[PDB]
Amino acid sequence: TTPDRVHEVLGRSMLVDGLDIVLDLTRSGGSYLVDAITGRRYLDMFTFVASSALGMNPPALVDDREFHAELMQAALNKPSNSDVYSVAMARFVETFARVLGDPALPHLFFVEGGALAVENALKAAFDWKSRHNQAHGIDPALGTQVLHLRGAFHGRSGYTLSLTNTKPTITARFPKFDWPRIDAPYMRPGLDEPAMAALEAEALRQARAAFETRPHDIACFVAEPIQGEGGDRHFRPEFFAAMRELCDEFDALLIFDEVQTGCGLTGTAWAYQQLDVAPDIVAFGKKTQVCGVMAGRRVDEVADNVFAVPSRLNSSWGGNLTDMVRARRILEVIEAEGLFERAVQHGKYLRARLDELAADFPAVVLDPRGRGLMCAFSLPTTADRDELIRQLWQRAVIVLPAGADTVRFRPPLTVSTAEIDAAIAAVRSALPVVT
Amino acid sequence: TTPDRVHEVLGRSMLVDGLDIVLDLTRSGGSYLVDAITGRRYLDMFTFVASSALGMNPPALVDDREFHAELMQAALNKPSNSDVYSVAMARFVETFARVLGDPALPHLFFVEGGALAVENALKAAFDWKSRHNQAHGIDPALGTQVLHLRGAFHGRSGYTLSLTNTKPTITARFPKFDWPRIDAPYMRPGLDEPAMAALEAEALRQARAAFETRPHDIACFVAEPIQGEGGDRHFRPEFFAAMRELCDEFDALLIFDEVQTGCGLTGTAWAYQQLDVAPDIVAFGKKTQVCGVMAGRRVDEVADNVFAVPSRLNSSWGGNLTDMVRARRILEVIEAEGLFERAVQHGKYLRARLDELAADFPAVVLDPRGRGLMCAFSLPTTADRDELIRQLWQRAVIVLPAGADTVRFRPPLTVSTAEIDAAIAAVRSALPVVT
Ligand SMILES: *Cc1c(COP(=O)(O)O)cnc(C)c1O
Ligand SMILES: *Cc1c(COP(=O)(O)O)cnc(C)c1O
């Protein structure tokens, strides 16, 4: 099978709606994807839907002969880490705890897939609430509902389909639980402090109303600290702090879905660290390669919780050992090279350029925004947005759409300022064409 | 981190309830796991919960220098196969279709994880039923329920938690849909043809009753062709053939969950091929490394089904590329070495030995059964069963429990008759001790 036959071969078995290239696995490197058909290089602001921290074939992994041996060792087989432990696994878990750990959240659980990471956070919360109810004389059949936001994306699995509400295509015709959903009071341009406070107070009102009309039945509140797929919607720290207080008042856990924001993209290990809100459970994935949850805070108040009792949470594999070994090495690079700090500084650079774009194209480049390297801007209509992405593609720059009118940037943590300049130059070239 | 410190390090972050060994990734081979602490060798009848087809470090993979290069290439990174295609991916898909494909089921979809494979089969069915309803003047809000069996195990995710019913520990305190569940008419010892027919007719009655009391609302019937976790319960081909007819009468899809039975364990690619029943959708995983579904038959009658319309099914990664590359090579070994046929012959050998065990220990070794290499027997009580497993462990043989009183054998497809003899000898030694 040859690069030029890839789309034909796949097309016999599956819907083939992806990018028009064939990935060269060997010649791709850093912030560049190589099309194996033409040899053309593509500037990567997409990073496998934000799942690549270092970009392709990072030198620290490719040149490391000892790591090669460890990776091969892991890659040849696929143990069930659920019941069979290894040195390779233990090294990963200890470096995860060191680099990404929170002392308040000591319980770690790993699984393949971001939606299932979120599901395990939910299951922890369902169990916690039922048992907390039981211990205080409340019916243990209560504690089965999930408070969540409009415009949320938490995945495409049985429980997360009841939470995700972006494109109808994702959720239509699939059975859902009737769980309480509230307005998302995200920052928008031309809203001052009092205006934002009023917006938040209304979501808070709706949240409080949900807790009071469904007594002892809401197990948790789940949120993205910054909504990704819904359109890079950012929230003030004040909103989540108010939600944190309200969750505690009604004995509900706070879960942050950091599958997209996590592992250094915003400039810290986790976006929540910048919002000064302490969650009870964090779900992670994408850049971490292996997915899962970190849990603690109020979780430990229920002694027979899901992390203390055998066989409550499980999967056959307990995550992919190859992913663990690769992630261990990635985390070591992040720590050794100070990549979180690099994300803060280069994020400030990218944001500044998007502000300049807004100044030069004020009716077209709307609402430039970001935290660290997680940046975006919007266009007047979805047609403009879709056209801009096509024009960037022709110029060999890969970016992703979000929501109705957003273009999002997801560069690797190792992106250089020259590479950011190249992406901005491509946007400047394309804009007169779309107008 | 040293082998003797593995359990200590992991114990700081997670519940450590697995096997008492530390896996030596390099020295393990074939039907033997090596404990890195002692160097003791363990006879493997467990195969990472039936997910390993060839056992550890098979020579055809370890000695193949070209494959090493391909595997390393895939292992260094983790592309989103959902939107970025590669030669490595296309080679996998084409060899999967060749070795495991069914001409009636041309639609292939891949995902990480067995439960999510089953969930995607369900989602295909929900969409199919709603749209089939709509096209025949029936309310498209109908078609949201799943007919399933008692003692079923389909996973631990949002939708499969509503199906799985083995140990209460797996499902307790998690929100479920109220879906119709019927008795499982599995073969048991000392039941003749008429007795079995009577048992099946009763399950059939219950199935028919479910279809009639929930009109147009049952999207599919899902089953394991042989129930694994529930206790290796086998069904006559007559039962599923009757279910096949009944599904067609009420316009519902038939889904086989072949995550445990699949990829050659029973002697054919899929267990369903031996039962002479044609499903509409098959979910697969474990031995396949990448998980997913094959779909066709009645699925294609709805033109805008989930395999024809973009973005209805998805995950970020679209399965693990390292898993695909390893699976491609495994499938090539299976095909080149005739491993399906090897499973039939060695399965007959194993079964014969378990019959001899039943003859020598008639009050203790109960209900010897199996299809190909998927074999089991039961003990009088769960205490006897648990003790037998402890006694086998002391003798360095790894087997798994199932249900209340079953011991299951899950050898690799490459198991030799001498290795089967060794496992049987260990059982013979242990039995007088348990009695
Ligand atoms: C994409 C993502 C998920 C789902 O992860 P998958 O691996 O595709 O299942 C969940 N939450 C957020 C915020 C995500 O970005
Ligand atoms: C174990 C298994 C699954 C679940 O697979 P996971 O990878 O653990 O999610 C589903 N169905 C059957 C029959 C299984 O054996």
A235 vs B269: CA distance, rounded Å: 52
A195 vs B218: CA distance, rounded Å: 49
A294 vs A296: CA distance, rounded Å: 7
Reported resolution, Å = 2.2
On whether both B196 and B112 belong to a single domain, the answer is yes
On whether both B278 and B359 belong to a single domain, the answer is no
Q: By residue range, what is the domain housing residue B289?
A: 58-338
Run of H or E residues at A130: helix A114-135
**SS3 state of residue B29:** strand
On whether both B98 and B178 belong to a single domain, the answer is yes
Look at A156 and B314 and tell me if their CB atoms are within 8 Å. yes
**Which residue puts its alpha carbon closest to atom 10 of ligand 1?**
A154
Q: Please check if A115 is assigned to a binding site.
A: yes
On whether both B165 and B155 belong to a single domain, the answer is yes
Q: How far is B172 from chain A (nearest CA, A)?
A: 8
Tokens read off for A301: 């108040």
| Residues counted in chain B | 435
On whether both B39 and B86 belong to a single domain, the answer is no
- CATH code of residue B357: 3.90.1150.10
On whether both A333 and A355 belong to a single domain, the answer is no
Q: Which of A160, A259, A260 gets mutated to test ligand 1 (max ligand atoms within 8 A of its CB)?
A: A259
Please, which residues 105-164 of chain B have a Cβ atom closer than 8 Å to chain A? 106-109, 111-116, 119, 123, 126-127, 130-131, 140, 143-145, 155-162
B432 vs B435: CA distance, rounded Å: 5
Phi, psi of A397 (to 5 degrees): -120, 125
**Which residue puts its alpha carbon closest to atom 11 of ligand 1?**
A154
Selected residue of B317, B325, B393, B398 to mutate for chain A interface (largest A Cβ count, 10 A): B317
Run of H or E residues at A366: strand A366-371
Nearest to B322 among A73, A160, A322 (CB): A322
Please count the structural domains in chain B: 2
Tokens 């390779």 label which residue? A88
List the Cα angle B342/B346/B351 in 5-degree steps: 145
**SS3 state of residue B180:** coil
Looking at A288, A314, A338, the residue that finishes a domain is A338
**SS3 state of residue B396:** coil
On whether both A267 and A351 belong to a single domain, the answer is no
Q: Which of B52, B162, B286, B323 gets mutated to test ligand 2 (max ligand atoms within 8 A of its CB)?
A: B286
PDB experimental method: X-ray
B97 vs A141: CA distance, rounded Å: 46
Please, which residues 157-216 of chain A have a Cβ atom closer than 8 Å to chain B? 157-162, 167, 169-170, 173-175, 177
Closest among A155, A135, A136, A374 to A255, alpha carbons compared: A155
Ligand 2 geometric centre to CA of B284 (Å)? 9
Looking at B305, B338, B371, the residue that finishes a domain is B338
Look at B79 and A48 and tell me if their CB atoms are within 8 Å. yes
A170 vs B41: CA distance, rounded Å: 49
On whether both A240 and A318 belong to a single domain, the answer is yes
On whether both A52 and A89 belong to a single domain, the answer is no
**Is the shortest distance between the CB of B200 and ligand 2 below 6 Å?**
no
A395 vs A333: CA distance, rounded Å: 31
On whether both B42 and B89 belong to a single domain, the answer is no
DSSP codes of every residue in B233-247: EE--HHHHHHHHHHH
Q: Which residues of B38-48 are buried (b: 16+ CB within 10 A; e: fewer)?
A: eeebbbbbbbb
Selected residue of B87, B132, B306 to mutate for chain A interface (largest A Cβ count, 10 A): B87
On whether both B386 and B289 belong to a single domain, the answer is no
Q: How many CA atoms lie within 13 A of A378 on its CB side?
A: 16
A323 touches B at CB < 8 Å:
yes
Residue type, A255: I
Closest among A242, A182, A176 to A209, alpha carbons compared: A182
Closest among A56, A2, A19 to A414, alpha carbons compared: A56
Tokens 């059982």 label which residue? B427
On whether both B108 and B229 belong to a single domain, the answer is yes
